[PDB]
Amino acid sequence: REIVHIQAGQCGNQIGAKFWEVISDEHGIDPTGSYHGDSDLQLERINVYYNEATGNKYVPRAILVDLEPGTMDSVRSGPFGQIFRPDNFVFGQSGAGNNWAKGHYTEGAELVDSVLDVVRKESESCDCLQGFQLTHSLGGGTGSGMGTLLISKIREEYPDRIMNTFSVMPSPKVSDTVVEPYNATLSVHQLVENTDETYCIDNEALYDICFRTLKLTTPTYGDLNHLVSATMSGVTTCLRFPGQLNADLRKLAVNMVPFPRLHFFMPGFAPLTSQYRALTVPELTQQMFDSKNMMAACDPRHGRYLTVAAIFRGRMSMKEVDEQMLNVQNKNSSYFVEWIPNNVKTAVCDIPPRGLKMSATFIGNSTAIQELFKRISEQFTAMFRRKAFLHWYTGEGMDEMEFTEAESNMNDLVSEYQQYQDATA
Amino acid sequence: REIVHIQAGQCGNQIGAKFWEVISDEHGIDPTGSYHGDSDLQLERINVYYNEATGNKYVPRAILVDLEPGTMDSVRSGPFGQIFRPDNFVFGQSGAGNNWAKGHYTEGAELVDSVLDVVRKESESCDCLQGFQLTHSLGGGTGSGMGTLLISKIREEYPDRIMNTFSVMPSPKVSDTVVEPYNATLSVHQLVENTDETYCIDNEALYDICFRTLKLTTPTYGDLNHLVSATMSGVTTCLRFPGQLNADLRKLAVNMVPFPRLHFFMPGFAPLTSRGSQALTVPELTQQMFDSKNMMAACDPRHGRYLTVAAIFRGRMSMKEVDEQMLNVQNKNSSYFVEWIPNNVKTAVCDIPPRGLKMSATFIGNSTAIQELFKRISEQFTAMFRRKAFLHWYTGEGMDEMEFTEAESNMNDLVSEYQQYQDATAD
Amino acid sequence: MRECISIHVGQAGVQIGNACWELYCLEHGIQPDGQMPSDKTIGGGDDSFNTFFSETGAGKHVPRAVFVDLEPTVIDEVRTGTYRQLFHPEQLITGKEDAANNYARGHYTIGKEIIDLVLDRIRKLADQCTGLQGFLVFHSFGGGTGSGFTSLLMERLSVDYGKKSKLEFSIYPAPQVSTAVVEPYNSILTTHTTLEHSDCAFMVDNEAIYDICRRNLDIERPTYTNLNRLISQIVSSITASLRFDGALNVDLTEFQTNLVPYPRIHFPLATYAPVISAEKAYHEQLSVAEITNACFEPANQMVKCDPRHGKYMACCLLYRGDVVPKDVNAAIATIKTKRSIQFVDWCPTGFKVGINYQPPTVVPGGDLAKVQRAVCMLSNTTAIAEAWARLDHKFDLMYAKRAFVHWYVGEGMEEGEFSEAREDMAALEKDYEEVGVDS
Amino acid sequence: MRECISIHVGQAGVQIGNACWELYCLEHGIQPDGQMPSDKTIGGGDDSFNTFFSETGAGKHVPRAVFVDLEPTVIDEVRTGTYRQLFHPEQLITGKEDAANNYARGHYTIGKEIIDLVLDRIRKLADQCTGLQGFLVFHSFGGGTGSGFTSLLMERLSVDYGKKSKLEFSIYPAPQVSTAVVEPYNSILTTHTTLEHSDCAFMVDNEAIYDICRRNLDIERPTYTNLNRLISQIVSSITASLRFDGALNVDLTEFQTNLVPYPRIHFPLATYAPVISAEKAYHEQLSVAEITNACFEPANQMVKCDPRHGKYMACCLLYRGDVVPKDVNAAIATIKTKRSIQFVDWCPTGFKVGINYQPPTVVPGGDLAKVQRAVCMLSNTTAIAEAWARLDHKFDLMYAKRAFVHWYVGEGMEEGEFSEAREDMAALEKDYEEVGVDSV
Ligand SMILES: Nc1nc2c(ncn2[C@@H]2O[C@H](COP(=O)(O)OP(=O)(O)OP(=O)(O)O)[C@@H](O)[C@H]2O)c(=O)[nH]1
Ligand SMILES: Nc1nc2c(ncn2[C@@H]2O[C@H](COP(=O)(O)OP(=O)(O)OP(=O)(O)O)[C@@H](O)[C@H]2O)c(=O)[nH]1
Ligand SMILES: Nc1nc2c(ncn2[C@@H]2O[C@H](COP(=O)(O)OP(=O)(O)O)[C@@H](O)[C@H]2O)c(=O)[nH]1
Ligand SMILES: Nc1nc2c(ncn2[C@@H]2O[C@H](COP(=O)(O)OP(=O)(O)O)[C@@H](O)[C@H]2O)c(=O)[nH]1
Ligand SMILES: [Ca+2]
Ligand SMILES: [Ca+2]
Ligand SMILES: [Mg+2]
Ligand SMILES: [Mg+2]
Ligand SMILES: [Mg+2]
């Protein structure tokens, strides 16, 4: 039933506000929180994300966290700003300075209890809480350092609930600071141990899609976040609308996580927008499995698919989506493990996203995701070999032992993906 | 910051009286003390040498001292005799008799307490005292013997202040007596130990400028003193006008004295022409300023090496011309500058020129060639001391004989120290 | 008179149970409000339909059924459906959290905290029985509740109701309508833990029901409503001997006696004919000889397998409608010489025939058409071992890499239970091999 | 919040502070009496310019600055200048006797008599802050006060404010306008003392700025007035990220993380473009590509060195004015191939870009032409070690003969403090050598 949403940091709050504004439009919720839609499928599972305030008002079960009031006042000043509960804004004034140590051990420690009070206050009012979803970046300080701190604190109090995150990977093509590989390697070390499902949203892939495909010479964060919100809306459709494929977080994890540490999903969307020609079901399936539509900069042909969840939105023939999906499996039969029979599952929703008649969302657990962590590890090692920029972290009480321990856990994850990329049956 | 000016002896009061005449004319002060000037730059640093009394009356911070009342009754009669403070006169009666021991040990000792009271009186009225400047000779008795005694006494009460002197070297070409080499050696031994800056004004070099250059067959003390007045007006321009190079005595000492004992400067002035000759450029000033003829000390700078040099230009001129000409003369004479002191030549340019000149140039050099001045005095000293001549003049005042050898051996070390750094190289 | 209690576990068991009880009312003329105008004994009686229906003082006929699901969404369909007034609120048991397609979650975690409540609601119906004969359990193989919790229920039913019969209606996993990749695991696990607590199990492959709906009924993409309405027709004709007067399979013991010679091999294959679409205005009428011949076509079986390359141990022909016995044995004589029927040498090569003169009933608005005669063939053939072989292979592929095992271990089950269940299936697969295969 | 207190020490620090604060007022619209008519929030507010300006109830906008000098004549010009009503009298601290170009007098003899009074005034300003970010310290390296007293002040600031960030705007000495021969001494002494107390220092070579004013502005003999008006433009571009807002505005502390890879390597090289006169700026539009190309010309840097002979560790471009990101990316890609920009192998070879939209302003009566766009480049290159070598060589020449050392020993210093400072300089030169060496 209920899911508690948390957005921490600049990137986490900016993509988190875009997620709430998109799904509110899909469920017929205006900025004031009133229902104004025509279909009854919009309120069938409205309580998985929205709390029903007295007066037919729907307030999101969202918690906004940051170490500085900057992005907080920016979210409140935009559209769908007054729909958020005012008591769920928890911010400090010092900031994290793009430092993972400041977000996790020094500055976030002062505010972590204020956040947990709102988390408890929202969870206490839940009839049947499934778990938590978190939006953040891994290359910054707050969403990276304090985000993984919140995950560890929440898992301590709700050990049997599902921990799900939308984690944004850093890329030199869209870089804020040079220490982004440091913050990323430290955060993934936490993600492999304290989360159950993680959607890998690579800023590298978002840039290449905006540049090489959408023909935007100078892409902005608003251009990247437009792709993120469309992907976030697609991967949560089975949670927000009636169905029975991956209707809840636990049933999704049982179908997508064959081994506990390999829980990093590669998302894909089709069509890529920013159009009057109508798309066809064979074209949606063709672009869904193409690397040009992957939200993570990985080549799926370089690895093998462990589990795949495809979901089609719009009004089409269930027979056609069955024909095209069974046909794309035959075209790429070499990229599906044989030891997991029937590892590709398909769902179909009738409500499409706004502005699109038909859409398709790809959710894959592929061993090719190791290229992402290998990329971060190469950028991490190039600096850590010379202990460059390490004084920003040791000045906050951190140790070099913690860096080597986080790097070794990353390399183990990579070699674990390689173990199943070559394992046959 | 303020400077306390002190003049001792006949020569010290003559050149000291002429000093207050030029700078008062430059700062627009009349013999009564009122400001008759027309430029605000004349009053910006007027308190360095003057006290501001009621009624806009500017009184010099001068202390006139001698062991005889003759020479100080005349400075009260000549021009600018009223502007001096009347109770700042301290005159004795017995006199010194051109005896260094008479001024330093016996007669000048009974008067040094009366002088010290006037010093503390003028020092009490100072917001932030810089130090003391002394005008005196090294050939006589009062300015030579008692002058040095005033240095040691004042240093004991003001040890962290700057002690500057305008010492006049004796010369047999204008010599008053014959015992002058004895007085110079005994006083240079004192000036080595108890002063921070000393402007060596050689009477020999002064006589040669008047005779050979200005063409004065019979040079009087007034002709020699006019060159001294132009010098002390030049070496004090950076202290009297809103500059920023060597604006005070301590910043000048840090720039000019690399080793504590080597603090005897040779000064130069340009232009130097008489009233019988007749378009002076910046390159001409720079050339004449580094010429041996324009040196106010009988020393050829090309016989030694410049440790540090301070250049002061006065008048309306192109500042780019000065920078290029100052850089020019340094490259063309690179061998005569020590290489282990980088950028040892500082140049200041004052807007207003001295009286009667369009542009002037004053030179302040710390050159190892100054040893020629000390070698000459030491040679005349040892010519008399070998024969024990006139030792009864000094031993008659209770002095000792080895006190003469101490003052000599020191001077010999001073010459050796100057030679030690002249031969030193960077590699 | 002897009463039967039906238990529906999981989504598949509840929704199939909803379709069956709707059909029972249509066949017996029971109205959705519980009233039965054709019944003359108000508030009691010992009729044949009383084995499945109990009567209140107000003449209301209540199904002897229990609905159990660990999530309330599927049960709410029954609570607000067309026959909502048919059931008491105490016959419907809902949990808060389902088993997440995890056998370990439905058996050990959620099953531990709900097993005593379900048995309490079961005992309340058993105390209303003068001679309870046994239970019929409806559940799926791949669901967490349908496999996990059902296994615990049969283990407890053998303790609280010993010597009573237990019949299964199971749903074999099919990928065209499957929702989980771990269904193969859950299937083997429940089969091993129930093999000794079940006397007869009717397995229905959703693959076969799916294709019958596509070929014979012209549904392009069949849904659960299409599958369940066809499945309830087979369940109806199997249980019609308990609900109507007759002599063949009048009680649950006779099912195991007639169809189960060896206890471990208690998975009889079901074949149904004819399946005609309603939109087919043209309405040919197949003779008994034609519909009996269709009972040997693999396209009409509930599990896709080849009985030509197996051996028969028991055979039961259940006719329903305008069928005379003279036409039956005439068809059996013609089918002897035209088919590959090989019985085991320790059994008589014969057929037990049951005729019910009342013809089948179709739900108004369904996809099935009205016929004058139909056959349901219950045969215990070794050819059904193919379904076990396909299931064991998919189990071996995943378990060789220990894939998804951590979901079960983290729920309390130990890894040794997996190989213990797989060893039982390897023994079951060899039991079929000894009875059927020769040199 | 995020207030910054500026400290101006000595003549150079005071006179540069005068030029900066005059430029700040022109950029924000603050009048010489402290009134800002555009400011609608009277008595306070959390605007961007409030990081450098506090507000009184009367609407006056007061700079968060302290001017301190051991002599009064330079600060007296501020007390009677055009912006005399801008500062409170307690913000201007003067002594009666300066340090006389002596580090020993600035740090010890004279400085100890005024240090507590200065820290008390700094505490008064720090108390008015809701979230003090750090200090900006303007001073010279060769003056007695700019070197000696600044060292004493930085040491006391680390005691009173812990590891709160402290940025330096230092003046590297040049013989063209040098006032003392012992300036190499005071430079080496103050660099060694403040090294572990400074998080980032922006050196400005007086000879570099002097030469820029000669070639690019056609001033035949530049003065401090000419040099300071150019220096304040670099200071304005660096701090513009803190005093203004915008979508593309990147905080300077975000550059500081990129600029300082190791604690001792915190000396970024600054470059400003365009530096053009009005006579040449006429009939001359300067695109983004031209000013970005001028940043890599060695004759445009704040410190005399050759970045082609070194390796880059960080590169930050700070644009202000009519600049769009499309033009920046095009200019950077062009320079990436037409120029040889060698980065160290242990850091990415990227360019961090920040864009302000407030165009550069000029003081009325200045030498700089009013342009529509400008750029300041902050880069961390090993080539800046050349400035340390030249300065250390002048030190070694004089110290070998112990010339002028008696002026420092007489004030209380020991000869060991000289060799200790020189040894630290030699280690710093080796540190810049080691970071350029490739990995094993
Ligand atoms: N024929 C048929 N099969 C069904 C139906 N519902 C589910 N299934 C099948 O049963 C399997 C899933 O079992 P479910 O009954 O959904 O699971 P459950 O018992 O509710 O278990 P949990 O939800 O995990 O607690 C899959 O193979 C489905 O295709 C139905 O109404 N009819
Ligand atoms: N750019 C620039 N350099 C200056 C300025 N004033 C002085 N300098 C330089 O700074 C050095 C001298 O330091 P100052 O600031 O004058 O000295 P101070 O700090 O007042 O020290 P003291 O007067 O000795 O107590 C020389 O290299 C000068 O060229 C100025 O306004 N601008
Ligand atoms: N896709 C995307 N990435 C962002 C966004 N904002 C920041 N990032 C990235 O996130 C990283 C910086 O983390 P940030 O969220 O700014 O830090 P925090 O506020 O301390 O959590 C860098 O890799 C940025 O490129 C955004 O709106 N969208
Ligand atoms: N230049 C210069 N030298 C003088 C003057 N008066 C005396 N001397 C020299 O000073 C020396 C004698 O010193 P004197 O003035 O008698 O000193 P006193 O004993 O203190 O009065 C001789 O070498 C004189 O030539 C003077 O007015 N000008
Ligand atoms: Ca009855
Ligand atoms: Ca305001
Ligand atoms: Mg950021
Ligand atoms: Mg279910
Ligand atoms: Mg000064």
Residue numbers in the entry:
A (entry chain B): 2 to 42, 45 to 277, 282 to 360, 369 to 440
B (entry chain D): 2 to 42, 45 to 281, 285 to 360, 369 to 441
C (entry chain A): 1 to 439
D (entry chain C): 1 to 440
Task: Give the text the authors published on this PDB structure.
Due to its key role during cell division, tubulin is a classical target for anti-cancer therapeutics including drugs such as Taxol and Vince alkaloids. To demonstrate how this could be exploited for SBDD, tubulin crystals incubated with single ligands were loaded into individual reservoirs. For this part, we determined 7 crystal structures: apo structures for both TD1 and T2R-TTL, T2R-TTL complexed with four ligands known to bind to different tubulin sides, and TD1 complexed with the photochemical affinity switch SBTubA4. Here, we used the T2R-TTL crystal system where there are two possible colchicine binding pockets available since the crystal system is formed of two copies of tubulin. First, following practices in cryo-crystallography, we calculated the standard omit (Fo-Fc) maps based on the apo structure and refined electron density (2Fo-Fc) maps. In site 1, positive difference density, sufficient for observing the bound ligand, was present at a contour level of 3.0 sigma when comparing 1000 randomly selected diffraction patterns against an apo tubulin data set containing 10,000 indexed patterns.
